[PDB]
Design a protein around this ligand. Sequence first.
Ligand SMILES: OC[C@H]1O[C@H](O[C@H]2[C@H](O)[C@@H](O)[C@@H](O[C@H]3[C@H](O)[C@@H](O)[C@@H](O[C@H]4[C@H](O)[C@@H](O)[C@@H](O[C@H]5[C@H](O)[C@@H](O)[C@@H](O)O[C@@H]5CO)O[C@@H]4CO)O[C@@H]3CO)O[C@@H]2CO)[C@H](O)[C@@H](O)[C@@H]1O
Ligand SMILES: OC[C@H]1O[C@H](O[C@H]2[C@H](O)[C@@H](O)[C@@H](O[C@H]3[C@H](O)[C@@H](O)[C@@H](O[C@H]4[C@H](O)[C@@H](O)[C@@H](O[C@H]5[C@H](O)[C@@H](O)[C@@H](O)O[C@@H]5CO)O[C@@H]4CO)O[C@@H]3CO)O[C@@H]2CO)[C@H](O)[C@@H](O)[C@@H]1O
Ligand SMILES: O=P(O)(O)C[C@H]1O[C@H](CO)[C@@H](O)[C@H](O)[C@H]1O
Ligand SMILES: O=P(O)(O)C[C@H]1O[C@H](CO)[C@@H](O)[C@H](O)[C@H]1O
Ligand SMILES: O=P(O)(O)C[C@H]1O[C@H](CO)[C@@H](O)[C@H](O)[C@H]1O
Ligand SMILES: O=P(O)(O)C[C@H]1O[C@H](CO)[C@@H](O)[C@H](O)[C@H]1O
Ligand SMILES: *Cc1c(COP(=O)(O)O)cnc(C)c1O
Ligand SMILES: *Cc1c(COP(=O)(O)O)cnc(C)c1O
Lengths: 833, 833
Amino acid sequence: RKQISVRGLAGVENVTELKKNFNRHLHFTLVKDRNVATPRDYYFALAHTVRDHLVGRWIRTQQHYYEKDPKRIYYLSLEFYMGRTLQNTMVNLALENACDEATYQLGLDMEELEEIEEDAGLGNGGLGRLAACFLDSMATLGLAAYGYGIRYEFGIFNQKICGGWQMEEADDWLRYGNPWEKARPEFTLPVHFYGRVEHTSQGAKWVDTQVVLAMPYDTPVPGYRNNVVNTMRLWSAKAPNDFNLKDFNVGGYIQAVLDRNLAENISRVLYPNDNFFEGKELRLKQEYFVVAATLQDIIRRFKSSKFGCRDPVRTNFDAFPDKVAIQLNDTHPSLAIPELMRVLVDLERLDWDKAWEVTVKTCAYTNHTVIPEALERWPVHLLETLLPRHLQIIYEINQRFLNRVAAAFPGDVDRLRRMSLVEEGAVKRINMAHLCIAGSHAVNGVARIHSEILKKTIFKDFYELEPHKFQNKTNGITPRRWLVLCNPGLAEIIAERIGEEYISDLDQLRKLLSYVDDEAFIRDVAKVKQENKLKFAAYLEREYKVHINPNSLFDVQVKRIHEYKRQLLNCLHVITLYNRIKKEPNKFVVPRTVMIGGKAAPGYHMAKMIIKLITAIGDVVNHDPVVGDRLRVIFLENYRVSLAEKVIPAADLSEQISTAGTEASGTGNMKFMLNGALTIGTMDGANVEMAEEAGEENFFIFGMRVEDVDRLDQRGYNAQEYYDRIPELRQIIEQLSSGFFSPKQPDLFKDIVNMLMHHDRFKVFADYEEYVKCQERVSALYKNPREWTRMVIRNIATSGKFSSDRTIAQYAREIWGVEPSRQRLPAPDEKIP
Amino acid sequence: RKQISVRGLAGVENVTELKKNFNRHLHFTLVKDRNVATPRDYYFALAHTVRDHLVGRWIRTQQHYYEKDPKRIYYLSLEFYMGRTLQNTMVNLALENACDEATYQLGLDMEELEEIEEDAGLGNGGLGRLAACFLDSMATLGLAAYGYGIRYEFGIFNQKICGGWQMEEADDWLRYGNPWEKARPEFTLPVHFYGRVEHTSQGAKWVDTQVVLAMPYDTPVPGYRNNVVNTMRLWSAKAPNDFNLKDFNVGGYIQAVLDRNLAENISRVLYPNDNFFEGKELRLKQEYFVVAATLQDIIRRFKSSKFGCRDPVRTNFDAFPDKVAIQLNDTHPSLAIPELMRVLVDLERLDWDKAWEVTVKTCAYTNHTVIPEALERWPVHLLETLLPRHLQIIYEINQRFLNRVAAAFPGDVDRLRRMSLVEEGAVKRINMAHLCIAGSHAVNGVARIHSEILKKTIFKDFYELEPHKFQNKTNGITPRRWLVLCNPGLAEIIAERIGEEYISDLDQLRKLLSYVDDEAFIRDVAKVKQENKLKFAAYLEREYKVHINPNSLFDVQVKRIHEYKRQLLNCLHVITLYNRIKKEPNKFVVPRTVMIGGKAAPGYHMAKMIIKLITAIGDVVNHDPVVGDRLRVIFLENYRVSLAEKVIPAADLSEQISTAGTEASGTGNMKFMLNGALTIGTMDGANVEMAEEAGEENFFIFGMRVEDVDRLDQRGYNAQEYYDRIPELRQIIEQLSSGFFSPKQPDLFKDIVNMLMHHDRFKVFADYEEYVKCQERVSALYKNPREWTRMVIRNIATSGKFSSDRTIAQYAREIWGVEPSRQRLPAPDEKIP
Ligand SMILES: OC[C@H]1O[C@H](O[C@H]2[C@H](O)[C@@H](O)[C@@H](O[C@H]3[C@H](O)[C@@H](O)[C@@H](O[C@H]4[C@H](O)[C@@H](O)[C@@H](O[C@H]5[C@H](O)[C@@H](O)[C@@H](O)O[C@@H]5CO)O[C@@H]4CO)O[C@@H]3CO)O[C@@H]2CO)[C@H](O)[C@@H](O)[C@@H]1O
Ligand SMILES: OC[C@H]1O[C@H](O[C@H]2[C@H](O)[C@@H](O)[C@@H](O[C@H]3[C@H](O)[C@@H](O)[C@@H](O[C@H]4[C@H](O)[C@@H](O)[C@@H](O[C@H]5[C@H](O)[C@@H](O)[C@@H](O)O[C@@H]5CO)O[C@@H]4CO)O[C@@H]3CO)O[C@@H]2CO)[C@H](O)[C@@H](O)[C@@H]1O
Ligand SMILES: O=P(O)(O)C[C@H]1O[C@H](CO)[C@@H](O)[C@H](O)[C@H]1O
Ligand SMILES: O=P(O)(O)C[C@H]1O[C@H](CO)[C@@H](O)[C@H](O)[C@H]1O
Ligand SMILES: O=P(O)(O)C[C@H]1O[C@H](CO)[C@@H](O)[C@H](O)[C@H]1O
Ligand SMILES: O=P(O)(O)C[C@H]1O[C@H](CO)[C@@H](O)[C@H](O)[C@H]1O
Ligand SMILES: *Cc1c(COP(=O)(O)O)cnc(C)c1O
Ligand SMILES: *Cc1c(COP(=O)(O)O)cnc(C)c1O
């Protein structure tokens, strides 16, 4: 509808420079002319002109580190959920407004072109987005940091609801190209698979291995206005030419060539599994592949440092921990630990015990869940086929480890079977979380309760052996994408009162508590959210047709569709709302639009069932005339980062409803809090630190605390109890059991009814009384709008702790041992020296 | 050693412009800086700066044709053997010398960088190079022409001789990228496979087909200094997202994604088969794929023309032949004919008989061989599975065709089984050469005897039915790559006397007969060849080590290794030479370096055997001390276009030794003739028109003419006869039979001995007397150097007829019906209008 904002300066020479370079790429890069270039061609010419302002800084940031050669942070993750890159790169370079003017005086709209860009969907959700937000934060804090992972040809599937069912389809995100990567095939590396271990004369050798090659592609990761542009290096698999062809004595020349895309399948697709574990060979291959190739790039750079010169010399890998820190995001790169031992002992010839001190001091591990089906416990027969030397290194690590445990708790023979990284049984397995605690020097959780639950439950044995290892580092979100970029209007009205230094110092938002009684600030804050609601209802009417009321409470739960996350409890609540105004049709109720969105992993039947329940409910509700427009249920299709930048600004209520003690942190919860939604949520994850930051009076907590959850388990949860005692709940179950919500096929929802009644791992009935109660308290407040905005102003004003710049400044200081910085690196300028 | 030449002007502003743009791409495109950029990075910055001078012209050449909208020539070929593109694009734009100065004053050597570029090996040999030379000629003659084919990820394999055996390896030519193509994914197209034909109400429909998508990549094809830049559009296969994923009810989400590279295998690899026929499903798929997608691009452009406006209107496909000419290179795109009928009848609803007149008038076919194992005769069961509607269209074409034949030769029932496009028998098959003659309006051969042999033997029946169809268009070579570019020194000394207009008017070389007695020209012509010999002996010493004598006759046969080409006869000759100076060690013989190079198709055992024989001979010869350096045998490894640009300038004698009546034309023979080698060859292929052009006295013809070959077949060839009567031949066979040439495994060569003796399809013994005789006559002349250079000056001076510009000016006029032109299109200059 309009905007100027402080998306930086649109100054005379630079708007001019821009338009020229735009027209240059459309011709020379695109080989398209004005009369034939479509909005996608206009998108790539600007994408190409914005990455031109980035290579100068990138090249100088990387030669800079060679010259100073800091300790280098390697963030190994198998997921990186980046979303789109043009506007984020414009924000961090301060080009937002010069390219908006430039595009204006060239007759295009930036926002049309910005919507053309495909999201890079290299992640499933929150572990992968945490990685993407960390990368922004490490560059904004001047850290010599490199994010490393796999370049998946197909990222997370694109979800389509057909007949209300999720239909998954392939994310061919590279179809039109990627202007942001730079393929580097000169730097390809081998990764060995299979083979045998010969034991001779001096050491072991892994022999007769198969060779896949690792082709790196680098993406720049620009800091917020400080001229640092760090790197995301993502490996692609390529078959070699000699073995992947020559091994002879008949078998088809064409067949040997077509069989190459079988080694290259290692990076074809991301595994789409939310908090579950799949013991598939292709996954362990992907896990070894990014470990092997990355550790070679690590050592290469450590062998230059300045030791490839001197500092001492006579290859002292002693200094390896003072030059390298490798962060394992979840156990997916836990083979970084046996592999660092392999290259150091086998290839580099250090003694076991030196190379162990060097491995534990450079590695650290971030635990992401306590739900036991998520734990990777790879069967031993898999590892002996695929990685026979690494298995060997794991057995010797385990041997030596349990010798520590038995020394320290002598005689405690059941502790020994519990702490072992080898899980005995029918299928002998390797417990990778155990590997990670044995070979890292810092193990951390993602939120204070999740960190305490690790010390007290899941890893109490390891905590008693080595209390010094366990840490907590509560998650964060980046203020640049999650505020500046999806909510420019909220950021400009904050910018107006307190300035802009808060975008890399979010704790400053607390100076906003002075304006909680300002009537100009209250009205502005509230107009921004009504505007946001209004542009999203438009988006919905446009891209997905639907039409909703902008004057309702926009109640939204968006995250992956898992039972512990409790889209079902939320569901039960909206079926109640419906039933209550059907009983009393002519009662005023605060009108609300409830929007649930998220993806199910392919073969998770319950999750596919819940998406069918939600769309089945909106089939009844959205078509009942007595309901009018007072209640609408919208399933939000193909949830991902660009849609989260659209929804979370338009939200009034944020559903963070998991059973206490299951969500380790959550980060969706933090994003909604700096964007002026109010939380309704259990004392779970970081919801506890958020309520603690704003004050419990300003948050809408309900439900069972974790102590009450264990008490109910001690007792035994009996869901028939809640059904019997609560008539509104009984009525809802029967409606489900009789086909009220599935007419032409009445027994349709009997899997979900049977579960809630008899197999509810997450206790949905136990929290239903206190949940519809709490929900009556947000509607009470909604219709006292000035007092909702003042509660909102106290949530927004207390979001500081949930910046990823604070989380990274604490890993930096207490795990990696580097000091952050914000001194901007010298200006982009020219010089080829 | 030095050069200035007339590689155009190196003028002040433009050398300056160049260096700046070089440094621009190395930074912004390459993201490499001077201190870290290798010679490959320097190659891509110049490749990128030379294609910058080409997009202006390309875009304006293509909008130009839209505006004037000529008849458009579509050259459909499954092979296109382009070799490398930088220097060829510099020649045609006149940038050779500005970029040589530019690179000089930047401290690099062009020739180092020019050697970095990978050859685009999208062809096997001569059919594919003919296509590549035609494209140059069509752009140099201002024709609205488009070359269409498949973009193979792997081209022709790279050959490596290990233990003297060919080892084939994959040509991953795209590893480092291609700076010359422009991917156009917005223009992807579907190609249907499998399915069924429903017959209902109005017409047939091909239903339940599988869908592969065709992703086009365009390469510019610049004319010689006339600002036309035409297009090579090459299709790539891409799996769709919906069917290649959704078809459900359990079967693995990861499996559905990994199974996509199975539709994309259609463009993975070129079939490496020289004049043979493989009836494999993947080949017919590749053949339908480039036909389907191309015919859609043809019709699209015919539906704009100006009829998508008017000219008449009420969709008159009548004018289709006056707007389109599609040339089928060999029978590999013969499905262009049933497919043009399918879209016109089934989709476009014309009557059969209108659409047949429109198909025969737009299609034309070039026959490339008479050797019967080369003929594609696709089994009927293959086509009914894969293309069931097309099979149907072929049966109805055949029905209607034989009704013409039987009307015109009433009662001649064996003619009817001979002319049928359906070859009855155990495996019923479709004769594709027959398809092509029924549905083209011009059928042509590639040289005057090959054209006569078609009218008299292989296609006499079709010639009697339709004499008007049969034509001849003798092959050509492009004077720009095959003279200007690999022989700048020979081109500058010609340029000195007669000027340079000969590079697009090669017939002008005849004004060189005036200098056949010029002693300055004789000495220059001879110094150029000694220089060339000297740089190739260096190349050999460098890249392949070998060391040879530059003062010998460089005797070279380079082409594919097939029995009809007769690398064995040449072999028998060098074993004789060896034996003769072993008999008489101290006889002066003219010293010669014999170089045989070329690739065998993978499973062609005889061809793999002949490469082993040749390297086995050089094992004896190159190590015999009594031989001294008087004779050396060099097998020329990994023969291809860039090596042919190195060898053919350095050649003194050119071996064009096939059994008369088998090589249809040959083009290697023409390249050697404009580069000052003298031919020894049978009266075969275009060797007959070449001898005829220079005078038989100036050529070294020997051997059986084709009449003598049929006489010997009438009689029955008995190779024991030649063995018995010729002692030098008897001695050679015994040396082979006893392991003289294969010591540690004596029976090694008994496949080749057994064949020559009992199964010689190509009569190698029949031509051996006259061949070692003719070979004594070139050595006689070699050691009268001034009289060799004067014979050479009469071959070079009479090469005009063998330009591809003459061949294309005759297809243009007598088959496609367009007039060539040489008026340069307006200067590249600016304007976005
Ligand atoms: O060359 C060095 C070394 O080699 C040899 O030892 C190696 C073993 O031969 C090899 O099999 C491998 O051993 C693994 C073992 O395979 C694996 O099962 C695992 O065993 C653990 C259990 O996982 C753990 O639960 C616990 O089990 C006990 C438990 O205390 C007890 O309470 C009861 O419940 O059952 C079990 C029986 O006591 O402990 C065991 C180990 O005690 O871990 C092993 C080590 O990873 O690797 C060995 C090291 O390379 C030679 O035998 C040895 O002498 C040489 O020093
Ligand atoms: O709906 C239109 C049309 O449909 C029906 O005809 C179709 C046929 O049913 C269908 O099978 C197909 O016919 C093909 C035939 O399958 C194929 O074998 C081929 O036959 C040729 C031989 O290839 C050729 O050698 C020659 O063979 C004769 C030969 O003259 C003779 O000397 C002796 O040696 O042997 C053979 C027996 O006489 O000629 C035959 C054809 O005479 O070609 C056929 C046509 O392509 O396609 C038909 C057309 O769609 C109905 O039968 C018909 O009435 C309708 O008009
Ligand atoms: O992986 P490396 O070698 O440390 C970093 C690579 O990218 C940097 C930024 O483009 C270049 O300065 C460097 O020369 C290049 O090799
Ligand atoms: O599987 P999810 O929820 O997308 C992501 C998981 O990792 C995130 C980042 O550590 C946590 O905040 C979240 O609680 C945890 O369940
Ligand atoms: O295949 P088409 O559409 O005929 C030719 C294509 O390339 C030409 C040269 O870049 C462009 O002018 C044209 O707009 C484009 O669509
Ligand atoms: O298989 P080859 O020899 O490489 C190529 C084939 O097509 C060429 C181009 O029409 C002919 O000149 C040649 O005689 C013929 O055998
Ligand atoms: C931040 C984010 C998540 C995380 O959601 P939680 O509520 O923490 O589970 C998942 N998906 C996307 C698209 C995100 O933006
Ligand atoms: C021209 C050429 C050919 C053709 O050789 P012929 O002697 O006609 O069989 C084959 N390969 C390459 C590399 C060529 O340059």
